[PDB]
RNA sequence: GUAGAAACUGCGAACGGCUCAUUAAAACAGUUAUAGUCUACUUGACAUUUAUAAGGAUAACUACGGAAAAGCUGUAGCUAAUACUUGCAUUAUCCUUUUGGAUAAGUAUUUGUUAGAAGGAAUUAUAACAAAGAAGUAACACGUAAAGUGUGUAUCAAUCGAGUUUCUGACCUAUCAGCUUUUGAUGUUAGGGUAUUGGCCUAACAUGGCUAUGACGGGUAACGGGGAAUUAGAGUUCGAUUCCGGAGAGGGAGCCUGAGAAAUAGCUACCACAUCUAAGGAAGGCAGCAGGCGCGUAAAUUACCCAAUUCUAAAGAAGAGAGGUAGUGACAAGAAAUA
């Protein structure tokens, strides 16, 4: 048969997973869920190789069995569950909240987040659909189908999502002052306010994004994540603060200690 | 014998109710030291009143002696040890004996047995 | 050369082993499922009527109702067929089988007595064996004992003590879960109503 | 209550592993579409035409056997289930204008007649009318806040993918110059079939389509790719083989099941091999792991373990010749005695 492959080779694992080459030849294939395998990572490596909480699959699973790991305040027991680009995960008894953000190099790193900001999660919508009764339901990048969205919300506008009530709070547009985050582009990891767009005739629309250091970089429209307006990032950024510090002048920063 | 104890990467894991830290023992001009002395040393360092709650492994004596690296772990209690530790580690630490040591012979005779050919 | 005479009413079967071929002529040419007077098989068997419903050939290949032939044949076996045990769900096997027509090749015969005769057979038409296990469904046992819905049948179960678990019961948890799902669907209706109500004001 | 042999039921077994025979615009690689489709588990939304709870139909088992036997098998009797099958309110809309009246009740899917948040273009979403119209909306199981969960179900979206598909790219050969077209070749119409487009196929219609820019043939001791050696740059040769994609399970062909196979440690028939045999009849595919024979210059142990990675399940305690460890191993590679 040629059915769905139920294995993932270690060498074929995505680069940001960072799997040792000698630690076997199989990678934990993420189960079907809210996000794609390439742009999401499993709790296994999240808590074994990134959090360093566990050292083995068996101990990862016996941590997982207890309802102490919560994503969006929802307990999860799928061992290879795709967390996604942007989400809120919580560990209860030790009372910590991790928001999955990017890194300037372009990896996945959990970021410490308080309860208040954890209650404030953002989802980029993908498309809106009209159903029976002339009602519009919009699907986010998290595979989340939220019905009854604001009429002012557009296809590329992002919407504030509340975790408990599962409701929309406020929409953010794609304006020249819209602070965005490149999701899967070659310039992944750099935050920017966008400088302009170019509406091309039926091809991948590109946008030129302006950095804090006046660096202009072009990336596709299909892989951006509006994270707030020009006032401030609505999401607590990681230590690197979303500024792609250059490779040549990274070594001078690294060498002083 | 007298030796120096170094603890690095000392962190606490509420998920396991444990603590993880890399353990180094400096014993220059002296060979490998028994785990009992370092067990007592770490117990009195961390005010531990019991011995069996600790797990020591990863001990590499390095070249020429004088420094042995290793990994040390602590548990909340014997209950935590039993719940979150596997049989081989338990046997090595010395609490319970191993299960029946047949191994793959279990699967061999499972294949030998056939469905609806044995009354039992 | 052996016959299992069974009484469905008495739930007991008895085996007779015979050699003489003259005793089998009345059952020759007779297909499975037909009734024959089994008088030549025994002096005390006179007046007994037997229905032939099973058998095997000399090598052990059994009969089959559909195949109206006198010899062993090969045909593809479907899953729901009466002479095929399943191996894989969908597996279809081709095996030899003997036809329904009875000849001088059967090593076994299965027959059931249908009409009682004049004599009595020791251990066949005198004693009987019960169900050996009572009904499990509450409706089944209720119909058996004719006590309708007056009371729970848990106090009138067969003991050997221990008692079987009764399905389709009237335990309070069933009603509790039914009311839970009813109130859940009502909550769903009211939350949908308030959702559409709050949507109906921001459309401007 | 704790369990629990056997069995029914559910899922997987379509993953993985091995090999490179076939393979020459084919596969593969980069680049597109599917506005021409399907999609297990999972997540997120959510639904229409006896009820203090309905019905049969069966295993294991009991008792008699057959043969030499199969992972073989008959009748009598029975019981269950989340196996199989029936079936129990209410909501929305219009009017005087919180509140009273009246109006109506099909989800997908198909047909006919209209209007018509997005995309790049809709016959799109969706809405209206007239006709049909499946499958469900729980007759099921455990128990968390100092109401919950499992299993199952209609539609939509993503997830894990798959099938088709635009464009660009291949070794030698003209002592291969004209090929294809009744037997579909090239396209039109109409229809069948598929999950969908399509000569995929059928009926009619037209004579078309490719080709020295090498078609059509033939050969390859040719699976393709990133990759390897040699490299100042150009280049030349190799790539079965760590991973991706394709193929195969002795050679063809066919089929059930299943979401997913033209599966092969699933079946069916022939061809070529080959097992037991009481002479009647049964049962087979090590290009899986070890190992033997044959071939050959040439290639390891009929070992141990699920401890590491990962997969399956009814998902902690069970499995996995996957995989790891060890044995042989002057394939190669690195450090380094004989002072």
């Amino acid at each position: 048969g040629k059915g769905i492959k139920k294995h993932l080779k270690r060498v074929n694992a995505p680069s940001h997973w960072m799997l040792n080459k000698m630690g076997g030849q199989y990678a934990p294939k993420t189960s079907s869920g809210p996000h794609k395998l390439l742009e999401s990572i499993p709790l296994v490596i999240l808590l074994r190789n990134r959090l360093k909480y566990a050292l083995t699959f068996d101990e990862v699973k016996m941590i997982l069995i207890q309802k102490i790991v919560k994503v969006d305040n929802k307990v999860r027991t799928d061992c290879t569950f795709p967390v996604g680009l942007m989400d809120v995960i919580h560990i209860t008894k030790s009372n910590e909240y991790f928001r999955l953000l990017y890194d300037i190099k372009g990896r996945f790193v959990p970021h410490r987040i308080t309860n208040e900001e954890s209650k404030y999660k953002l989802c980029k919508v993908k498309k809106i659909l009209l159903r029976k009764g002339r009602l519009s339901i919009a699907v986010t990048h998290d595979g989340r189908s939220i019905p009854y969205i604001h009429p002012d919300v557009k296809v590329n506008d992002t919407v504030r999502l509340d975790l408990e009530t599962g409701k929309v709070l406020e929409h953010l547009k794609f304006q020249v002052g819209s602070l965005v985050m490149v999701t899967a582009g070659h310039s992944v990891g750099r935050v920017g306010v966008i400088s302009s767009i170019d509406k091309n005739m039926g091809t991948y629309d590109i946008i030129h994004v302006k950095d804090s250091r006046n660096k202009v970089f072009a990336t596709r429209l299909s892989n951006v994540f509006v994270i707030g307006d020009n006032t401030k990032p609505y999401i607590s950024l990681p230590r690197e603060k979303g500024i792609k510090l250059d490779i040549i002048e990274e070594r001078r920063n690294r060498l002083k200690a | 014998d007298q030796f120096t104890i170094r603890v690095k990467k000392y962190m606490s894991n509420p998920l396991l109710r444990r603590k993880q830290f890399a353990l180094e023992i400096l014993h220059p001009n002296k060979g490998s030291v028994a785990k009992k002395e370092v067990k007592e040393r770490l117990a009195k360092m961390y005010k531990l009143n019991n011995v069996n709650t600790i797990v020591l492994f990863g001990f590499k004596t390095l070249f020429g002696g004088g420094r042995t690296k290793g990994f040390g772990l602590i548990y909340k209690n014997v209950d935590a040890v039993k719940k979150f530790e596997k049989k081989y580690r338990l046997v090595r630490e010395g609490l319970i004996d191993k299960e029946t040591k047949a191994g793959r012979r279990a699967s061999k005779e499972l294949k030998n047995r056939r469905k609806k050919v044995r009354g039992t | 050369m052996k016959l299992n005479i069974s009484n469905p009413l008495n739930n007991v079967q008895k085996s007779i082993e015979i050699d003489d071929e003259k005793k089998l002529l009345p059952f020759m040419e007779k297909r499975i499922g037909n009734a024959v007077p089994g008088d030549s098989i025994g002096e005390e068997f006179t007046g007994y009527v037997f229905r032939i419903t099973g058998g095997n050939d000399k090598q052990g290949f059994p009969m089959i109702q559909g195949v109206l032939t006198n010899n062993r044949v090969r045909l593809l076996f479907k899953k729901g067929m009466k002479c095929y045990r399943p191996r894989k769900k969908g597996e279809r096997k081709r095996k030899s089988v003997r036809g329904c027509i009875v000849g001088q090749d059967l090593s076994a015969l299965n027959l059931t007595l249908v009409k009682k005769g004049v004599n009595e057979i020791p251990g066949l038409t005198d004693k009987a064996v019960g169900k050996k296990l009572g009904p499990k469904r509450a409706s089944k046992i209720r119909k058996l004992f004719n006590l309708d819905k007056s009371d729970d049948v848990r106090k009138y179960v067969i003991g050997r003590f221990i008692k079987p678990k009764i399905q389709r019961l009237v335990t309070e948890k069933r009603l509790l879960r039914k009311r839970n799902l009813l109130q859940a669907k009502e909550k769903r209706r009211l939350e949908k109503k308030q959702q559409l109500k709050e949507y109906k004001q921001l459309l401007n």
Side-chain angles (χ1 to χ4, degrees), chain A residues 24-86:
Chain A
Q25 311 102 327
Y26 304 88
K29 185 168 214 212
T30 78
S31 289
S32 84
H35 300 79
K36 320 195 188 298
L37 185 165
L38 261 306
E39 44 92 15
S40 189
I41 64 94
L43 286 319
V44 186
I45 55 100
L46 192 155
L47 84 83
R48 178 187 42 190
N49 312 91
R50 325 302 298 267
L51 293 213
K52 312 288 197 188
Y53 266 140
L55 311 173
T56 315
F57 209 31
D58 301 345
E59 66 194 47
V60 162
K61 224 254 182 178
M62 52 199 326
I63 304 152
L64 166 71
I65 57 194
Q66 303 114 45
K67 294 306 115 206
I68 41 190
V69 41
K70 299 169 63 61
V71 152
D72 206 65
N73 318 117
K74 312 295 140 74
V75 288
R76 285 319 181 172
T77 328
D78 305 358
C79 196
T80 79
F81 196 78
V83 287
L85 152 67
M86 150 50 184

Side-chain angles (χ1 to χ4, degrees), chain A residues 142-161:
Chain A
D142 301 275
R144 268 197 214 261
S145 49
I146 312 305
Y148 284 130
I149 32 77
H150 307 289
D152 64 83
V153 174
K154 279 313 164 81
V155 198
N156 263 136
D157 291 10
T158 190
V159 286
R160 295 275 341 120
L161 173 144

Side-chain angles (χ1 to χ4, degrees), chain A residues 105-118:
Chain A
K105 134 187 155 165
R107 61 161 99 188
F108 272 40
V109 277
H111 180 54
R112 294 292 309 113
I113 278 288
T114 58
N115 185 87
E116 177 22 76
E117 195 46 51
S118 83

Side-chain angles (χ1 to χ4, degrees), chain B residues 43-59:
Chain B
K44 56 179 138 219
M45 167 93 220
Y46 275 152
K47 77 230 172 307
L48 315 165
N49 34 31
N50 38 308
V51 37
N52 58 71
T53 190
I54 75 166
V55 183
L56 320 168
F57 53 84
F59 286 141

Side-chain angles (χ1 to χ4, degrees), chain C residues 1-6 13-18 20 23-28 30-34 36 41 50-58 61-63 98-112:
Chain C
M1 291 315 78
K2 72 114 184 189
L3 276 82
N4 319 328
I5 290 301
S6 187
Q13 41 187 284
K14 180 268 324 302
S15 68
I16 70 84
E17 301 66 350
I18 63 107
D20 172 67
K23 299 175 64 109
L24 299 321
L25 284 292
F27 333 108
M28 277 331 98
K30 297 302 225 159
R31 321 191 302 198
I32 317 174
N34 85 95
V36 290
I41 44 187
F50 299 118
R51 188 142 287 207
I52 167 61
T53 176
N56 315 115
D57 76 335
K58 165 249 144 182
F61 299 143
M63 332 307 286
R98 209 234 164 270
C100 86
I101 299 311
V102 175
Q104 301 323 308
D105 40 308
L106 283 86
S107 71
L109 275 165
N110 303 330
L111 290 94
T112 166

Side-chain angles (χ1 to χ4, degrees), chain C residues 23 28 39 52 67 111 115 122 129 132 166 172 177 179 181 199:
Chain C
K23 299 175 64 109
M28 277 331 98
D39 44 356
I52 167 61
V67 171
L111 290 94
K115 303 166 205 172
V129 187
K132 101 183 195 273
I166 309 297
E172 281 282 325
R177 293 315 312 265
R179 300 284 83 82
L181 70 96
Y199 174 68

